[PDB]
């Protein structure tokens, strides 16, 4: 009490309020499932994300809509600051009707200074600058150097942005989503569970480092299309993508960070596999690979080939499945499998196993 | 088919020439010269604060120029700006992509950056007109994961992404002014010189390269590690730098001598290095080995000086204050201990 002062007590009160919201967000993040999604390039993860995350099932959250429209205003400010920089860094000088344009640039800096809300007079002076036909034709020349791809949508709708009434759409956040760099967080709700699918994709070449952050996870979805034995995705003479998938599952399922987290393995294209196994047998590939000529036992044998890649571990169980064109079955299997994983981990935490 | 081979032979000849040069100028090693200085043997530092409020595990931290505020990034979504002297939180920035691997703190105290797995560097403004912390800029010109972000001024940031290149940005413009691309592996760490004229960068191919921000060319290149590099920190004179790796070997490379000086390797460590920091004098060597505890090497005799134990998991990032008052370790047990 002696060391504390008025502002120190108010800072401790703010720290208690912050720690309270921190803990609330932490228990909200503990009431939700985070799960990884690795898949081969031949396999196809997009269709899995589209069937598991229905647009009609999960609408856009109203609370994040203010953050989304703030992103929209920030992209508008970025677009107009790129326009005034292009009219400042222009190699061949272009005549301007207003000499105050450069001061207008500073003015666009001044609205950059506050950035509280949309400034009406800033929209008016940007509209007056855009009224010049040379400023409109400058965008085609600005396409030459490094520029935002989703910039014409904001720079052509400047009068529509100038209206204070605004419409939130999934196309609006798709304009920011189209950059598609990095991991994608797809959020969907099912039976009071908040699933968060993290698909890392083929953006990054080497994974010796950034797999180590995925230690705290619940499931590992692993989508491989078993029709790849005849299909071609080869940077070398190894035409069989199935061996690539076997090495992938051997590197992931036997990894030191994933020694307690299970793998839900999805055989994606089974109808194409059925057609291509009725057309030609799997005996051509390898003899031991061909357990039986029939569809069913081979469909067992492939998943058996994934069951014995787990090197001696009994604390993680491969929940195998065959993907069909039904939204209910796949989401219900993910629900039941992740629920089983959560039950096993919490009972291991209790010590009952 | 033959021109590529003879250019490769010319490159091998140049590597043999620079190896013979650095061997020829290597008459007296540092460990032979430092046998007369008085060694420090008992460096016992006690934890003075254990910061609490992180649900998930820490990946980075960075001290301010005032030695009182320290940023910290974790996976729980909230990037927390701690006040060190009195344990209370100052800001908890909600991140968009919670899979962040780095953070920084501007030398003016205004901005705070963070990269992550989303291949984007989010720079936040703190001293703004409002009380919240808004997303100021989002530098998204990278392809690989970001590993270290550093602030030169409130206008220039240097980032180490995982697409085998570093960048040099202007913040308000949004585009990368300079692209530093000679690395072959994923670039893992940065270290700035105190005069902010040149920086070293460590990749996964054991090559620590010194880049110059003025021109944009690779000034120097160092290769002395068996495994991949995880962390680098300059010497406070700016003429040398320590470098960590997964081969349990800190190595102190020299700039004017253009080679390694000493090797801070013990025999009972089969554990990786995750972060490396120097004190103000540069006598100590704070090394975050991932055997659940930190270690204090002597940067002139390669002797151990103190184990900083007390973390339940891997120490992910540690930093010494800019005045030298303390050193804070952030580990995967979600704690931020301040050893003094």
């Amino acid at each position, epitope marked *: 009490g002696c060391t504390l002062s008025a502002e120190d007590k108010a*800072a401790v009160e703010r720290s208690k309020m912050i720690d309270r919201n921190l803990r609330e967000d932490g228990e909200k993040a503990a009431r939700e499932v985070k799960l990884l999604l690795l898949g081969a390039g031949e396999s196809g993860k997009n269709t899995i994300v589209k069937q598991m995350k229905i647009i009609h099932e999960a609408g856009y959250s109203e609370e994040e809509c203010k953050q989304y429209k703030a992103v929209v205003y920030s992209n508008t400010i970025q677009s107009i600051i790129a326009i005034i920089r292009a009219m400042g860094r222009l190699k061949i000088d272009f005549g301007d009707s207003a000499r105050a344009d450069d001061a207008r640039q500073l003015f666009v800096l001044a609205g950059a200074a506050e950035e*509280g809300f949309m400034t009406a007079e800033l929209a008016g002076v940007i509209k007056r600058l855009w009224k010049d036909s040379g400023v409109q034709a400058c965008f085609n020349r600005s396409r030459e150097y490094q520029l935002n791809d989703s910039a014409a949508y904001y720079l052509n709708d400047l009068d529509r942005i100038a209206q204070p009434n605004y419409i939130p759409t999934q196309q609006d956040v798709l304009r920011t989503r189209v950059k598609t760099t990095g991991i994608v967080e797809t959020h969907f709700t099912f039976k009071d569970l908040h699933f968060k699918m993290f698909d890392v994709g083929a953006q990054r070449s080497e994974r010796k480092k950034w797999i180590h952050c995925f230690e705290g996870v619940t499931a590992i979805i692993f989508c491989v299309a078993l029709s790849d034995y005849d299909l071609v995705l080869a940077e070398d003479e190894e035409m069989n993508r199935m061996h690539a998938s076997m090495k992938l599952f051997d590197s992931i399922c036997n990894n030191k960070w994933f020694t307690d987290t299970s793998i839900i393995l999805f055989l994606n294209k089974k109808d194409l596999f059925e057609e291509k196994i009725k057309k030609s047998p799997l005996t051509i590939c390898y003899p031991e690979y061909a357990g039986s000529n029939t569809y069913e036992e081979a469909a067992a044998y492939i998943q058996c080939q994934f069951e014995d890649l787990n090197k001696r571990k009994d604390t993680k169980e491969i929940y195998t499945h065959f993907t069909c064109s039904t939204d209910t079955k796949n989401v219900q299997f993910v629900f039941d499998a992740v629920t089983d994983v959560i039950i096993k981990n919490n009972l291991k935490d209790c010590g009952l196993f | 088919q033959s021109e590529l081979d003879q250019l490769r032979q010319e490159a091998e000849q140049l590597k043999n020439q620079i190896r013979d040069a650095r061997k020829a100028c290597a008459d007296a090693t540092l460990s032979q010269i430092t046998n007369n200085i008085d060694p420090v043997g008992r460096i016992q530092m006690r934890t003075r604060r254990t910061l609490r409020g992180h649900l998930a595990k820490i990946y980075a931290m960075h001290w301010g120029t005032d030695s009182r*505020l320290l940023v910290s990034a974790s996976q729980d979504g909230k990037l927390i700006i701690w006040d060190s002297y009195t344990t209370n939180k100052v800001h908890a920035i909600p991140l968009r992509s919670s899979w962040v691997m780095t953070c920084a703190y501007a030398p003016s105290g205004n901005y705070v950056a963070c990269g992550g797995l989303d291949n984007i560097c989010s720079i936040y403004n703190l001293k703004t007109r409002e009380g919240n912390v808004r997303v100021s800029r989002e530098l998204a010109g990278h392809t690989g994961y970001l590993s270290c972000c550093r602030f030169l001024d409130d206008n220039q940031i240097v980032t180490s992404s995982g697409d085998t290149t570093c960048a040099l940005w202007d913040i308000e413009t949004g585009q990368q002014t300079t692209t530093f691309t000679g690395h072959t592996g994923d670039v893992m760490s940065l270290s700035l010189a105190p005069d902010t004229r040149l920086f070293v960068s460590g990749a996964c191919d054991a090559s620590a390269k010194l880049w110059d921000v003025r021109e944009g060319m690779c000034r120097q290149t160092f290769t002395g590690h068996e495994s991949d590099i995880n962390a680098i920190c300059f010497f406070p004179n700016g003429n040398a730098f320590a470098t960590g790796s997964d081969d349990a070997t800190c190595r102190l490379f020299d700039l004017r001598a253009d080679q390694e000086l000493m090797t801070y390797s013990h025999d009972n460590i089969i554990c990786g290095i995750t972060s490396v920091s120097f004190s103000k004098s540069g006598r100590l060597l704070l090394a975050g080995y991932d055997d659940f505890n930190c270690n204090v090497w002597d940067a002139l005799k390669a002797d151990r000086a103190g184990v900083l134990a007390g973390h339940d998991n891997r120490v992910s990032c540690l930093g010494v204050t800019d005045d030298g008052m303390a050193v804070a370790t952030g580990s995967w047990d979600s704690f931020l201990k301040i050893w003094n």
Partner: single-chain antibody, 232 residues
Framework: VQLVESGGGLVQPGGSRKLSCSASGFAFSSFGMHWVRQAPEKGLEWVAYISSGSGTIYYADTVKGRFTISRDDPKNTLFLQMTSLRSEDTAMYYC??????????????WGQGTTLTVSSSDIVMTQATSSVPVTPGESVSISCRSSKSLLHSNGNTYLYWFLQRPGQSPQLLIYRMSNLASGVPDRFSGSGSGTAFTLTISRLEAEDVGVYYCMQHLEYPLTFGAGTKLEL
């Protein structure tokens, strides 16, 4: 940053009145809010304070119990309900923002000031000077004497300097008598050690005239200064 407060102006003494302050333009949900009286032809004086999230409420000694106060976060509004008004409460009321962290500038923004007229221990901040006539363009020195050593153990001396233009609202211009506020030009400096503090103006301008207040923020209640005015 817009604070518009309303309520009152012709109130019978002994009756209740509820004043509403709308807060638009900032994160109101994490701001402790203060109130400030200003009697006609007299100095400013503190009323009450609400912490962030309404955790800890403080009142002044002379208005304790008679007033009640509330914060509505989803509408971003602040309500001051005053019961059993006295004949000395005829004043202009200011509802001001405040945020408390290291390097923060609380009391930085001021309301326009609502008017409320009625029909009819403490750290005393003894400002000796009250009016200094001076021409524009010279160094001006305003002294502020306290009654308690404001130098706390943690090293920062909790005294703030405030500028109020004639016919306008007050404005924070110096916090903790070393640092300058976000928006003031680099002309105003603060010096002194614990007992006595000094505001030094390098060059004076047409916008630099007004009344200067000094506030101690070491202990509640926040007793203000008399207010030294500058005329030309």
């Amino acid at each position: 940053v817009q604070l518009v407060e309303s309520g009152g102006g012709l109130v019978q003494p002994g009756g209740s009145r509820k004043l509403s302050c709308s807060a638009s333009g900032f994160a109101f949900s994490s701001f402790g809010m203060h109130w400030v009286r200003q009697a006609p032809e007299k100095g400013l004086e503190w009323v009450a304070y609400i912490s962030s999230g309404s955790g800890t409420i403080y009142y002044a000694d002379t208005v304790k119990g008679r007033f009640t106060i509330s914060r509505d976060d989803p509408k971003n509004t602040l309500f001051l309900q005053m019961t059993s008004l006295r004949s000395e409460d005829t004043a202009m009321y200011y509802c001001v923002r405040s945020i408390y962290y290291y390097g923060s500038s609380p009391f930085d923004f001021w309301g326009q000031g609502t008017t409320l007229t009625v029909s009819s221990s403490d750290i005393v901040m003894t400002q000796a000077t009250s009016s200094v006539p001076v021409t524009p363009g010279e160094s001006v020195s305003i002294s502020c004497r306290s009654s308690k050593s404001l130098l706390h153990s943690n090293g920062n001396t909790y005294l703030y300097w405030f500028l109020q233009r004639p016919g306008q609202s007050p404005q924070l211009l110096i916090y903790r008598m070393s640092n300058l506020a976000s928006g003031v030009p680099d002309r105003f400096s603060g010096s002194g050690s614990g007992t006595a503090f000094t505001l030094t103006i390098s060059r004076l301008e047409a916008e630099d005239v007004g009344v200067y207040y000094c506030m101690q923020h070491l202990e509640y209640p926040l007793t203000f200064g008399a207010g030294t005015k500058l005329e030309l």
